[PDB]
Amino acid sequence: QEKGITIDISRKYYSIKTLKAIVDEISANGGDYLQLHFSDNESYAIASEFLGQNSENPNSAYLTKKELLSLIAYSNDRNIMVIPDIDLPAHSKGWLNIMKEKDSGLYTDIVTDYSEDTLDYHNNAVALYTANQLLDEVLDLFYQPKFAGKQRIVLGGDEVPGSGAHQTDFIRFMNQIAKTAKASNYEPQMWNDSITPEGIQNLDRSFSILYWKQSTLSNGAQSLDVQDFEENGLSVYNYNAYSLYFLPSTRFTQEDITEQIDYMKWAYAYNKFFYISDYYKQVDTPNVKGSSLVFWGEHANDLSQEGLLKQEKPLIQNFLGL
């Protein structure tokens, strides 16, 4: 049973010092991985040659290449694998908006008709070609020889518009970017929520699944659960959107953080998943491989770096102990 911490840096800048401090806590407590969620609607938060984010000076928009590589090395030195999390096709407004500036011709050819935040996953060649360039860069940057044959990448797949009604396009798109990952010897991962019973039969079985919340179909019916992923030979990680999602904010006191700990102490188990009918449903299938606490950044706008650590370090310690 692996344990990970997931940090959203797309929504919130963490300095290299803060991130190494977090890695220290992970290390001190026996964690296995740090998932770095760096591409979302608000920003693409690491250096990128493809996107023109080439500054080698620290800044407040993105980690430099040297900072990032340093973070990965620091983690690997403590036997902690770093998992890139780049979100496709949706949650893409950060990098798409860069493409709109950098090459507006190409932008028109890759963006969905009605969602500025979504790449055209509808059988669009130029869109896949563009995404693959960006993925190639990521898979290279995140290369970790100390974990060859164990590397994973999160490719997104959450909250994808049109996916219920165009599931065939969606699954074909995810399978295509999974090939890219697999060609570099990475295991591809995606969130659970946009895969429907119609789509699962066709999803590449190399995928493992980050299970945050059981979906409801358009029509009202309950969608895939962990047992359904089991039946399709798909491994699952518990990312329970109640017990394992936390949003740091200056609106919290330390006593509020203790109540969060107290809550997580009874709500969290590695195999208690967020089902429609039961928020902390214990599932005992053999395809559960671990769990992650996730720190989303939407509410962290003017938290100081110290304040980030004040909230996060206690929650990391507790989670990695339970």
Numbering used by the authors: 3 to 324
What does the paper say about this structure?
One key enzyme class is the poly-β-1,6-linked N-acetyl-d-glucosamine (PNAG)-degrading glycoside hydrolases, of which the canonical member is dispersin B (DspB) from CAZy family GH20. DispTs3, DispTs2 and DispLp all consist of a single domain with the expected (β/α)8 (TIM)-barrel fold for GH20 catalytic domains. The β-strands in the centre form a tunnel atop of which the active site is located in a groove, presumably to allow long chains of PNAG to bind.
A clade containing DispLp, which has 30% sequence identity to DspB along with potential dispersins from two other species, is separate from members of a second clade containing DispSf (26% sequence identity to DspB), DispTs3 (26% sequence identity to DspB) and DispTs and DispTs2 (26% and 28% sequence identity to DspB, respectively). Since DispTs3 and DispTs2 have the highest sequence identity, as expected they have a small r.m.s.d. of 0.63 Å. Interestingly, in the structure of unliganded DispTs3 an acetic acid solute molecule was present in a similar position to the N-acetyl group of the GlcNAc. The acetic acid also formed hydrogen bonds to Asp160 and Tyr247 with distances of 2.55 and 2.75 Å, respectively. A second tryptophan, Trp193 in DispTs3 (Trp193 in DispTs2 and Trp188 in DispLp) is present at the base of the N-acetyl group. A third tryptophan, Trp214 in DispTs3 (Trp214 in DispTs2 and Trp209 in DispLp) forms the side hydrophobic pocket in which the N-acetyl group is situated; mutation of the corresponding DspB residue, W237A, completely abolished all detectable activity on pNP-GlcNAc, suggesting that the hydrophobic pocket is essential to capture the substrate. An intense monosaccharide peak (≥5%), perhaps inferring a preferentially exo-acting enzyme, is seen for DispTs3, DispTs, DispLp and DispSf.
